[PDB]
Amino acid sequence: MSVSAFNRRWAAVILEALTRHGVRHICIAPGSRSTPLTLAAAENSAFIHHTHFDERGLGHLALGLAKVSKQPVAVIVTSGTAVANLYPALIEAGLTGEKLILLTADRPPELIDCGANQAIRQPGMFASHPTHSISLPRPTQDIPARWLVSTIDHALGTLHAGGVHINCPFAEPLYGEMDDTGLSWQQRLGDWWQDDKPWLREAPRLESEKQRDWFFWRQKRGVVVAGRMSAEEGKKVALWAQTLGWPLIGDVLSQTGQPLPCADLWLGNAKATSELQQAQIVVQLGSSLTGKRLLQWQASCEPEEYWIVDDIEGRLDPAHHRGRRLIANIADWLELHPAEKRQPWCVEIPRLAEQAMQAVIARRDAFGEAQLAHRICDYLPEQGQLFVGNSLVVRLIDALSQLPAGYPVYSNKGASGIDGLLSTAAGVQRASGKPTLAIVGDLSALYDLNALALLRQVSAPLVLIVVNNNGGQIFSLLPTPQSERERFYLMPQNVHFEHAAAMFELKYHRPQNWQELETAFADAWRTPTTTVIEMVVNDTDGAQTLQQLLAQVSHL
Amino acid sequence: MSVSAFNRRWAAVILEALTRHGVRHICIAPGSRSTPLTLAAAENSAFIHHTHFDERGLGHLALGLAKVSKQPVAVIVTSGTAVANLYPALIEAGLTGEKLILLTADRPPELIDCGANQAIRQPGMFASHPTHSISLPRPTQDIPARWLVSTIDHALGTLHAGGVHINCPFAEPLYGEMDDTGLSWQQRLGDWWQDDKPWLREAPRLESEKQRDWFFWRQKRGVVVAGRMSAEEGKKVALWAQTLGWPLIGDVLSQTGQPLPCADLWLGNAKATSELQQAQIVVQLGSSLTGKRLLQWQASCEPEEYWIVDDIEGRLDPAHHRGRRLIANIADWLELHPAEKRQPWCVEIPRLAEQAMQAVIARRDAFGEAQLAHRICDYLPEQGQLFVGNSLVVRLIDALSQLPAGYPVYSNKGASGIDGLLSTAAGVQRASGKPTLAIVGDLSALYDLNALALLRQVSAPLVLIVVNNNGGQIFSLLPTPQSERERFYLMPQNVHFEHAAAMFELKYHRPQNWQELETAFADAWRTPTTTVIEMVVNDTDGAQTLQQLLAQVSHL
Amino acid sequence: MSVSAFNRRWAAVILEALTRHGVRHICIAPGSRSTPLTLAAAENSAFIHHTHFDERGLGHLALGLAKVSKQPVAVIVTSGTAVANLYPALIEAGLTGEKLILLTADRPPELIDCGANQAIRQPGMFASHPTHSISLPRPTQDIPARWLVSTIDHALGTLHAGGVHINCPFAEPLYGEMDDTGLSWQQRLGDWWQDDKPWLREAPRLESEKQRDWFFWRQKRGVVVAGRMSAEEGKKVALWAQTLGWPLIGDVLSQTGQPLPCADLWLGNAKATSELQQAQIVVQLGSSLTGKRLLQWQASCEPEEYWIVDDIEGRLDPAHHRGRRLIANIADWLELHPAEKRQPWCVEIPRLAEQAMQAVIARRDAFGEAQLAHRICDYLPEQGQLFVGNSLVVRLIDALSQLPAGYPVYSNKGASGIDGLLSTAAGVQRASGKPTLAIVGDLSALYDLNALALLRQVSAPLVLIVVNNNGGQIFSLLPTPQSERERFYLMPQNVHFEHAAAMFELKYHRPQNWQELETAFADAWRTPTTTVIEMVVNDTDGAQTLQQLLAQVSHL
Numbered sequence A, B, C: 001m002s003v004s005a006f007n008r009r010w011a012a013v014i015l016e017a018l019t020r021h022g023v024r025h026i027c028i029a030p031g032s033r034s035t036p037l038t039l040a041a042a043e044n045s046a047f048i049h050h051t052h053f054d055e056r057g058l059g060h061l062a063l064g065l066a067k068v069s070k071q072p073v074a075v076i077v078t079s080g081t082a083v084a085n086l087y088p089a090l091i092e093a094g095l096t097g098e099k100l101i102l103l104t105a106d107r108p109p110e111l112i113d114c115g116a117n118q119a120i121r122q123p124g125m126f127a128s129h130p131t132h133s134i135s136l137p138r139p140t141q142d143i144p145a146r147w148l149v150s151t152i153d154h155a156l157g158t159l160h161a162g163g164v165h166i167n168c169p170f171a172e173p174l175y176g177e178m179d180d181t182g183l184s185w186q187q188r189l190g191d192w193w194q195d196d197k198p199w200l201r202e203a204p205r206l207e208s209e210k211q212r213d214w215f216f217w218r219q220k221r222g223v224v225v226a227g228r229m230s231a232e233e234g235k236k237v238a239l240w241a242q243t244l245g246w247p248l249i250g251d252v253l254s255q256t257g258q259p260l261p262c263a264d265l266w267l268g269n270a271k272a273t274s275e276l277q278q279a280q281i282v283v284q285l286g287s288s289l290t291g292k293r294l295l296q297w298q299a300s301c302e303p304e305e306y307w308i309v310d311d312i313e314g315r316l317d318p319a320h321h322r323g324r325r326l327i328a329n330i331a332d333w334l335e336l337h338p339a340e341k342r343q344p345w346c347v348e349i350p351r352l353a354e355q356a357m358q359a360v361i362a363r364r365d366a367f368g369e370a371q372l373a374h375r376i377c378d379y380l381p382e383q384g385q386l387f388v389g390n391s392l393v394v395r396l397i398d399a400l401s402q403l404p405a406g407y408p409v410y411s412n413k414g415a416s417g418i419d420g421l422l423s424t425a426a427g428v429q430r431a432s433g434k435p436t437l438a439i440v441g442d443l444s445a446l447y448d449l450n451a452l453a454l455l456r457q458v459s460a461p462l463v464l465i466v467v468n469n470n471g472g473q474i475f476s477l478l479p480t481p482q483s484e485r486e487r488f489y490l491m492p493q494n495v496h497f498e499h500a501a502a503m504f505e506l507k508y509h510r511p512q513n514w515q516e517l518e519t520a521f522a523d524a525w526r527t528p529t530t531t532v533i534e535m536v537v538n539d540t541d542g543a544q545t546l547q548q549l550l551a552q553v554s555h556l
């Protein structure tokens, strides 16, 4: 009975069990206590392995893979604060639905709370943020392999969304040659080793029922609000709202084509709010709405019913309207609730939206971040994807641009953390294999700076644009107090990113006008590598331009 | 009444109350929901304020500040994944005793679990890792200020060691001019506002009693094992063990002067373990023992009694010996259990330690990480301090060098994370104001790379040595399997740090020999700035040198 | 601004919201802090109010009501240990699926952890046993009513099974005349007050999909195992299994009619185990299987697939077979996977089941608890229901009796507690309004003795048989060691229950033979009251009779 070999057999059951649920990507950080998991994973031909040294970035890389591939993605981490570093991506996964399977190696129970090295209390350490939590017991052959596979199978089979914490204790010795210890224990699973299915299949589906009065409600004056959803869903929602004759308010994340662009501007005009007051129903598809004027309009509107359709559980209306919360795949839901062609009821809003867009176009020339947001459609890679950072860039793109229907957009908009954007973008790119444009601010680029290491391995060109406005200039847009603003809010770091790019041998451009930026992009798309494009802009020009456009459009 | 003004009144009671328990340093990350806290702290003249954009590094900076100053240190963070980024530093503080007061802003209860932006479930999210957890209620004048101050006074007054999680929800609006809202509510505390005492003084001391049979046990054949303690404590333990005539096995962190150096080597010799089989009592002062040979000996020794004296709570002997766990300040404990002058009882071990040290001396010439560790005592800044990173650097110094008694050594050996060493070193430096030598591995430097921003501001010279052996070479010291070792264990990142240093305008040196290294050091100690010294070494030389010195010393 | 009036309005929103999710029965215990809830409930005409002074019994009465009604049942309790007494029924509800809504009054946050009277920490006190937990905030007008109703609507709407803990803090004053305070706040909800729907409808349904290979599996050699389910599902499962030609092993709780009765005896016969080895699939419907021989058979059998179909979630196979865990209403599942008539495949089992029952019939004469169990069908009230206690009674009825198909049987077989059987039986009776036969052991009756107060109010005759064998004679059946058995296992209490019955003015009988038992029953059914029939039997005769019938049946 070799402890090291049985630790290995136990782990091989866990990992092989994961392969029966769609886990193909596994992200691994270095460690000693995780050896049984890591070796089980390395010897398993089902996995694509990714490696990173920073477990917070490691968690965000897994999140980007899961976000893009829609599979569960596994993560192996050693014991101690490495486990803690998984918290941010786990939090975000719990909010937006990515299936992250966290395999956290642990010390055995005899080494907890007694001053041993790198030993901490890990069961329950993520509180209520995992969808399921499994605390595996100390490995022993007195517990049959069928229990372990069944525990794993219950956890993955019943997972509608979000992360799973699987705490895996192992006693030393961890190293040593494999002998037959644990082989007959494994062989009790019979030909399951050669199968493609779970040992225990427990796969209940969670779905709201068809709404049987939809045919009554679809004849009313409605509004469609389109939040985060897949690209194909964005197209279906566009055609659906058009057939209904209802105005479609489309988020940067919808991929609807935003037929009423610049909603964050024209929702500031009283003609629009007044016309919107006639809506008897709002059907919102998807969630995590971006614009401030749209969030305020949602919070103040009083339709007879407010419906939110999404495949993520729980309340999604922060204004708590009377209405419905419908759990469904958005495309399936539209098939169950089809549109009948009806005469459009909005007259003032389309003209207002065209005028707002025309006001933004009048201001496209200055070499600023507001204009980059407005012109961003001109730089999207062909057959590619966009990853949009948090803070001002997602706001400016939402307010000032009209992104094309069905062009894929990704984001970390569950909790809107600025802590894992580059590594998430690296997962997005690796999962799809498509050329990727990722836009972030300077504080966001500094936060996840070491994720530049990951960006040295992309399967297609990735352009990382860093808008360097010297601090978090979102706090120049909000009414922060002037005396404390720079030190306690903006926090300018007075850096450039040329040396960061050279450190990881990434191409770098710092364009000074539109022609140089166009040159930078045309060069960058030429090879499967990451290019850093730094846009240096005056600190507050973007926030001020957005405010001025808000006032201008509110007086139309 | 004005909600924004009352929010800042509530927060001002919180912050001012912290000043009554020794809180001097406040570390602040940027955010909007944190406005009541941040402005309350910014207006309070009692505080020194530190800022940073990454909350993980922000927490470790507070950890270094508390580590040196031995005072509670406060942290202000906004809602969301920013709070989760504090987990590693909080875990380490829960293990080594630093008192971190985490003030985490939150959305109001009506905005949890409903799709609001940057809103997550925050009460309890650090599980059992905080020493105290307080979930403040939604601010209201119906709860009197005396309750609020009493709650904080209870948490800080009864805080023996570890972190305090204080979750502070605030409702909008957050911005707006201060009016008289909440003024009379505040004035119900009377002249407490001008006092230096807590509103409620609750400060019970936790201490083991004098051991009344100490006069019996100090005459037996004893061994002193010295772990982490303060520099003063290290010298007092050295004199105490010498007076007892007991061998002193001194850790790199003990500051005892290590009168029997290279214990990680000579404890591998059968003559030493055989002599140590005669010990009737082991008195260990401090914890987090570093060396492998010392851990194995502690694990195998069978004295009649094993005592651990430390000012942190809980079990600290991972081999679970029969004996005593004594909670005390080590200097106080030595005073209560004084030595008596007795004849030394070990004869073979001193001869053995001299031989091991000479075997190390014979190999001092090669320009390697083993040799840098052995020679580090020749490079300590006068009246300075040493910060030792984790992985090989602390083990090689521990095994191969003899650090001078009473020279302050700092580290993160609670959980031995490699995730916050640079920001912790910045805090260590800022708290003491002393010149600082910090030594870390390359992966450790990559993990906390953006902490170089913090190192742009030190009050005295800081030398950061980055030992670049291209990966985590601890996994060349351990018997990791050869085929998986590089991809899944070592993870070489093939980088240098000249561009990192250049990005943050730090002086940089890449010495190629001893003479260039001493030139680098002589230059660096001249100004109050950080100098980055990259020592490029061959990947596996350090690990092999250590293994050969172990074998050689085993055969003496 | 009246605090007592607003407390009442907040509570009235909670209680009215509960009426929209089917809550009709509400169980109330006395208290002062619960006043806002209790008075809101007393004013609401939608409710049937039940009262009891023991909150443990109060929790089990609610469990019995919910068990019968198939509707969420509310409970109101005051602050302190009253809340803790709810734990047993809450745990059982989490195992068998009853929806108990626990409204636990609490002190406000300013009175927790400060030495106030009857104030304890109540959020989270039921750990993971509730399906949902809500910690309501301190009541205030600044949190809108639509939030409070939405929070409850989410909790009740997404509740598939089990209890909900809603902690309701209230500040003083609690008493005082209703003025206008909070009226306009309530009025925000508009005509929701005159509506019969939730404010927010969130009712996603969890169900496994059709098994698309069922047409293959239903023509194999299968076994049907019938656990706990409804009376109607019992009849449909019987007809289904008969049509398939599969042997039906039916539990006491199945109401299948047990066409192969005395399985706890004939599964001890080697011919049966050998014949059932031929089974290629087991489909189990329901769970909480009773018989020891059936649990051992399940644990040892090795069909190709093992399926458990039930309306509750989670793993239900304690032997962790390879197979399927199918979440469904059992009747819906049967219509989705219909039987086609095929010839029976078992040859030995029908004769052996007939023989086993005939061996029981041979021993029916003695006036013992085994024979009472075997003859219990002779005493079932027409158009009534049976409540079976735990320990020996349920096993003896399972092993020795053949209960009619579709005759309702109720029990507390989730955790098999003996702590709330009389108050559960009282709830079963009150919710259905039907005449009831409840059978319990003496220690179970002592445990819940004050529940006789509840049994003074039944809407139809309830007969309570107490089998008094002087202690827990289950431990004479189990191989407990003889020397410790009486003091530490059996614990005879040497009591009778005539004075118990007299205390609560219930008719009482102690029959000495079958004619006297018949006479006692004939008297008891004449009025809508509770009758106590104590059957005094020799301590170990039941266990001995069961053992001997097992041996006899194994030698067939």
Ligand SMILES: Cc1ncc(C[n+]2c([C@@H](O)CCC(=O)O)sc(CCOP(=O)(O)OP(=O)(O)O)c2C)c(N)n1
Pocket: A390, A391, A392, A393, A416, A417, A418, A419, A440, A441, A442, A443, A444, A445, A469, A471, A472, A473, A474, A475, B030, B031, B032, B055, B078, B080, B081, B082, B117, B118
């Ligand atoms: C991990 C963490 N910790 C702190 C924060 C707080 N926080 C923000 C949220 O407030 C805004 C998101 C949102 O609400 O949707 S934005 C922001 C500044 C970003 O600076 P930048 O990259 O330079 O971009 P810029 O502002 O355009 O100039 C910070 C520091 C956070 N989000 N995440």
Ligand SMILES: Cc1ncc(C[n+]2c([C@@H](O)CCC(=O)O)sc(CCOP(=O)(O)OP(=O)(O)O)c2C)c(N)n1
Pocket: A030, A031, A032, A055, A078, A080, A081, A082, A117, A118, B390, B391, B392, B393, B394, B416, B417, B418, B419, B440, B441, B442, B443, B444, B445, B469, B471, B472, B473, B474, B475
């Ligand atoms: C946050 C976190 N996550 C992962 C680990 C696992 N872990 C280690 C534990 O074995 C620590 C040992 C020790 O006890 O000191 S060491 C180690 C390698 C460090 O590489 P380096 O800096 O380049 O230095 P070198 O090895 O000397 O070459 C890692 C990656 C961790 N400790 N903390």
Ligand SMILES: Cc1ncc(C[n+]2c([C@@H](O)CCC(=O)O)sc(CCOP(=O)(O)OP(=O)(O)O)c2C)c(N)n1
Pocket: C390, C391, C392, C393, C394, C416, C417, C418, C419, C440, C441, C442, C443, C444, C445, C469, C471, C472, C473, C474, C475
């Ligand atoms: C609250 C709690 N605490 C303790 C127990 C343990 N426990 C039992 C479980 O082992 C068995 C339940 C079952 O499986 O059905 S049975 C049992 C004896 C009951 O005595 P009885 O009424 O006199 O009946 P008789 O045994 O037939 O003579 C006890 C004391 C419990 N169940 N619940």
Ligand SMILES: [Mn+2]
Pocket: A441, A442, A443, A467, A468, A469, A470, A471, A472, A473
């Ligand atoms: Mn910025």
Ligand SMILES: [Mn+2]
Pocket: B441, B442, B443, B467, B468, B469, B470, B471, B472, B473
């Ligand atoms: Mn290294």
Ligand SMILES: [Mn+2]
Pocket: C441, C442, C443, C467, C468, C469, C470, C471, C472, C473
């Ligand atoms: Mn009994």
